């Protein structure tokens, strides 16, 4: 029924900023997870509620692939129960997450001589993101009680911040591409299954 288009997700030329993280729905296709897990291409490949070696034996109603770019020392925030600027304000996994977090160093593709500042993360927000919530607004953040009126100033901040990805950065401040696979099984016929 056609192979699932994982390459469309994992080898995309352009990845999203985490604040505007990208979601692709995967449905009606044969998924080979082992070829991802056993590729030796990833520095993180961990699953919650499923084993990585058993993914090829599982059927799901739908799969969601969320993808974005963060720095390496923030990869640890892409896990249930984690807190920090990324989990709080950018991309939040639920406590009962079933799926996989997959990450790899993308310095060879996302670093520029002179610095790559294209990737942004939300630095300020009034409250924490709910699980799988996406906030792409770009309003001036009111830190105090006086309204901002579209204007920076005292207690009034632009809420997005560039990562400063210089190629000479330490590995903790290097860019990592991240894909979060979410597996849903509902009481519908399974559309995404493993091979054989």
């Amino acid at each position, epitope marked *: 029924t056609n192979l699932c288009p994982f390459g469309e997700v994992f080898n995309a030329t352009r990845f999203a900023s985490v604040y505007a993280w990208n979601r692709k729905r995967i449905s009606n296709c044969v998924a080979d997870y082992s070829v991802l897990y056993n590729s030796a291409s990833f520095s993180t490949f961990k699953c919650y509620g499923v084993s990585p070696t058993k993914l090829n034996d599982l059927c799901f109603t739908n799969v969601y692939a969320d993808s974005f770019v963060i720095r390496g020392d923030e990869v640890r925030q892409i896990a249930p129960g984690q807190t920090g600027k990324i989990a709080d304000y950018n991309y939040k996994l639920p406590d009962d997450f079933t799926g996989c977090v997959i990450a790899w160093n993308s310095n060879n593709l996302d670093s*520029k001589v002179g610095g790559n500042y294209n990737y942004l993360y939300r630095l300020f927000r009034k409250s924490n993101l709910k699980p799988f919530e996406r906030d792409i607004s*770009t309003e001036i953040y009111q830190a105090g009680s006086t309204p901002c009126n579209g204007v920076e100033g005292f207690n009034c901040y632009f809420p997005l911040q560039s990562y400063g990805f210089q190629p000479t950065n330490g590995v903790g401040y290097q860019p990592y591409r991240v894909v979060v696979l979410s597996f849903e099984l509902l009481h519908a016929p399974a559309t995404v299954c493993g091979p054989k």
Partner: nanobody
Amino acid sequence: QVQLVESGGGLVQAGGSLRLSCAASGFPVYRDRMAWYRQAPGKEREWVAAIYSAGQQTRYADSVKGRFTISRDNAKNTVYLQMNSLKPEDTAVYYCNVKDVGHHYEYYDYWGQGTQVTVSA
């Protein structure tokens, strides 16, 4: 490594125009946010204008709305502030500004040396 150099400015009569430049070295001008501030004699440094890579591209303080326009040139790694219909209240030292994040999540404010802008009544 990160450095901002303001140029432009000088003396102008009320109603005249000026273009300030901010040459950036160590980082690309295409980034989250680049800002212009100004500090008048005896006053607090205040935000004037900013250009953003996401959302509304430009924002301006109320007192300069409709009279200033900010822009960027990537080939020259520069940000410009075009100032029209200048008024004596616009007299100040002008600074460009960026806010960077470091390895240990420090937030550093980078300023240039400033350029003097004088508008005579």
